[PDB]
Design a protein around this nucleic acid. Structure first.
Ligand code: MG
Lengths: 98, 107, 82, 95, 17, 98, 87, 95, 107
DNA sequence: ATCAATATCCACCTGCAGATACTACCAAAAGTGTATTTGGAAACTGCTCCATCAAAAGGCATGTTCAGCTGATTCAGCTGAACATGCCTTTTGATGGAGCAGTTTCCAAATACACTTTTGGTAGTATCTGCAGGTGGATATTGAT
DNA sequence: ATCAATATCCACCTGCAGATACTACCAAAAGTGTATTTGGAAACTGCTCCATCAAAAGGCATGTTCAGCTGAATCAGCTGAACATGCCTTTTGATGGAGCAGTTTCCAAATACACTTTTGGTAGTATCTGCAGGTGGATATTGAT
């Protein structure tokens, strides 16, 4: 009975997912979330397939960059765990609010 | 009797098209003879620079076909391309391997 | 077994995005926070896209609607036109 | 069934001069299209602004140059300006 | 090819490496 | 002799300068600095006095902005003393540097 | 003629106290001794960038005088748009 | 003495409509001038582009209006769009 | 019977001027009769929103003449004006009084 | 150390998705020949920017002193990482029609011109006035005790 | 919770700097009101490609066990704040010198424009093959002992 130690699989995922380029959210959940948010601006809306993917590409890129700046704010406070306050500080200095 | 303004200027890039895109763009009333030659050169140059380094990155993955991921590795590994494209996402480009030192295990 | 479309953006998915960002450890409050930020991103972009759609008297959001939107929100995307 | 212009033909010709045994995916060629159009818009835009500031009706070689100087970082700018005077040299010397 | 490419290309110095 | 404790005048100064709008750099040093830098780009250069003041207004607004962001960085680290690592983290997250 | 006096080390005229006041407006209470050098570097880079572009606009105009408008266009390009000097 | 023109005269009219007993320093008028020129460019720019994006060659009150919806935030958009619809409709029905 | 288009439209803001600036700024080939009227109105609406809020800062600080500081307090204290002008510096404006809580003394 | 569980790495294989190549058709670039527009070259302003200097507040440099902040140390408790299963959600692949876009048609709208009229800028002049900068004196804040 | 040092507040009281408001005034611009051009909304229709909807497939929700991370408490060293003291350098406000922006007038190049001749680049299509899987077996890494 053999069990990997906290944060060893983490590094692996890091190396894995920094090597790949596949989108990392499942398409349908996201397609649903787009049409929802979009319903609120104009009803009965249709979406080119390339429209939705352009959005997922942009959205995932954004979040991955935010996690990078978030991670630097965590590491700056002498932690290794990202917390809301790291996400919040990254958005504040980036000028996304406050 | 005809000879493309490109073949004259020494360029694979369409001096003709560039000139038209400058007119149908409302940049100015008039467009000097050289401006499209210049502009076309600059776009060719910058294409070569990326396609050069993308080539080099494709070659390191034992690959003959340049993919998005190759363009991304070339651009973010180059201080000047990476600044020019500072606010640009390459779709299907992923990121540069980078693990902050303090996240590395102790032994 | 019905749930919100946002919760569709699952803890494991959000964990993978973080990992691509080089994150080793993640507080449980991150997943709700991330969903918040994502909703605002999509809100801001889809709103501009749709505004382009309405302008062109169309009932279908094109890839260009999104690319033109991303541009003016300072997230220029490459490989969907423009 | 109407003509959808791109720069692909010209990206591919430069690819071959630079890496003659190297290909390029649809999705990568997309990204080089985006790229050219973007720098086209940035350079043409700053050139437009320059002409407007100096109360000029005309974007010449000079405006493109100055725009390139403002928009390209350090070395990229120098090499871009040389490639750019060169092509305008070659073209003024063609009967 | 027949382009005046940059002789040397430097990497950007990332904060935190 | 009666001392204010460390911090009390710092907070007095925060209140005073946050209330006012006068430039905080001496005019002449800043004008010299401008001349040096411009000279180093192009000799025989001259300056409308308003150009120098436009630069001074831009420089001070920038530096004050950077100190807000910098201070957020110190506090995120549970300090109240700004250090160079704070300015650098701020400029990285502003995307003024890699 | 007279030729200009040599300009050197003029950065050092952004004194410790001028930087303390800027931080104070920034809401800063305590300041490491290393901050003043770091700040002078950040300011030199900022000025260089803006003056480089302002001077580019001067040269392209074929003038020998840097105008407030040259600086205002330089600041607009740089995403540091400034109100109160024209444009 | 080459006539350099501004938006002052109008900014003052409007000052006097909302705060009849209030003045404005020339610096503060300097700033309101920069502000008008700035929002003018941003709207004209978004409009230019919006027209281009739709292979149109005319900037109409229809392009300005979308420009305003893109550039201004929620409430300033709402009100801005009213005042402009009103002004137009009127101008049209005053001929 | 000379009527300004301004007067036709019910505006202080000069519709002629705005028509011309859209002409000379090479935004498009041609400019609709509505465009300058709608733009001059929006411009006028926004300059009125700022002057209203600056006028109130002026009176709050016991003053009669609006100075840049009054424009800064108005813009920075309004969530919407602050976003419209978040990448704009107001010469001689200063900043909003704001001390981070943890920096204040005592327990 | 040893010992094994699991991850990782390289060589070879091979079906087809996704390239490269090929062709005819035509939109759009080039060629020629007048049709306009411009952007220096010369030649003068006045504006304003450099310079230099004298006198004096005003802020800068430096040294001393110790309050209290940073950061190293230790430690307990909680909070995220890991992991073993099946079920529920997504992914895949196969049809009906919304609606994009293709295109021609003609009129309401916008341009082009050259009149006439009025606005908004400025220079000049005076004419007024809000407020900056100063000065007491009454009042608040901070830190010792 | 008393007291004293010293910072701050506020109401007076000036002299302009800078605002406001005349001119008269004109020059450029905006407007007027036909003469000419054309861009875009209109309506029709075809044919993508987008929404839907039902079998194929792995990814995710789940709850448990605990490694090790976060943050709390403590403490000592020493960095940065305060401030006193001495005085250099900036601010201020003149004067004279001229460099250089900024105008305004000839144009000979330079670019637009209208029309024709040519062909480069696109869209079907029609082949070709790079490489993403997949397998097999060697070796490295990690964590238990
Ligand atoms: Mg020098």
């Amino acid at each position: 009975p053999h069990r990997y130690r906290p944060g060893t699989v983490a590094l692996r995922e890091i190396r894995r997912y920094q090597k790949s380029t596949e989108l990392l959210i499942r398409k349908l959940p996201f397609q649903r979330l787009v049409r929802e948010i979009a319903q609120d601006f104009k009803t009965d809306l249709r979406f080119q397939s390339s429209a939705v993917m352009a959005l997922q590409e942009a959205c995932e890129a954004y979040l991955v960059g935010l996690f990078e700046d978030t991670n630097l704010c965590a590491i700056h406070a002498k932690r290794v765990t990202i917390m809301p306050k790291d996400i919040q500080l990254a958005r504040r200095i980036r000028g996304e609010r406050a | 009797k005809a000879k493309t303004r490109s073949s004259r200027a020494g360029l694979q890039f369409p001096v003709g098209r560039v000139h038209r895109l400058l007119r149908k763009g409302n940049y100015s009333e008039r467009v000097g003879a050289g401006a499209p030659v210049y502009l076309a050169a600059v776009l060719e140059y910058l294409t070569a620079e990326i396609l050069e380094l993308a080539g080099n990155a494709a070659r390191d993955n034992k690959k003959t076909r340049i993919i998005p991921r190759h363009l991304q590795l070339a651009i973010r590994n180059d201080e000047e391309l990476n600044k020019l494209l500072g606010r640009v996402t390459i779709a299907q480009g992923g990121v540069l391997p980078n693990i902050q030192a303090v996240l590395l295990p102790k032994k | 077994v019905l749930r919100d479309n946002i919760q569709g953006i699952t803890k494991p998915a959000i964990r993978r995005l973080a990992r691509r960002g080089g994150v080793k450890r993640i507080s449980g409050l991150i997943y709700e926070e991330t969903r918040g930020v994502l909703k605002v991103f999509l809100e801001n972009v889809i709103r501009d896209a749709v505004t382009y759609t309405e302008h062109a008297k169309r009932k279908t959001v094109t890839a260009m609607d999104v690319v033109y939107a991303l541009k003016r929100q300072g997230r220029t995307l490459y490989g969907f036109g423009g | 069934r109407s003509r959808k212009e791109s720069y692909s033909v010209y990206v591919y010709k430069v690819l071959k001069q630079v890496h003659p045994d190297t290909g390029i995916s649809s999705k990568a060629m997309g990204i080089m299209n985006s790229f050219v159009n973007d720098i086209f818009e940035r350079i043409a835009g700053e050139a437009s602004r320059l002409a407007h500031y100096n109360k000029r009706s005309t974007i010449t070689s000079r405006e493109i140059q100055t725009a390139v100087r403002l928009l390209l970082p350090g070395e990229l700018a120098k090499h871009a300006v040389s490639e750019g005077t060169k092509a305008v040299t070659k073209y003024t010397s063609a009967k | 090819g027949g382009y005046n490419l940059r002789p040397r290309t430097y990497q950007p110095q990332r904060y935190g490496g």
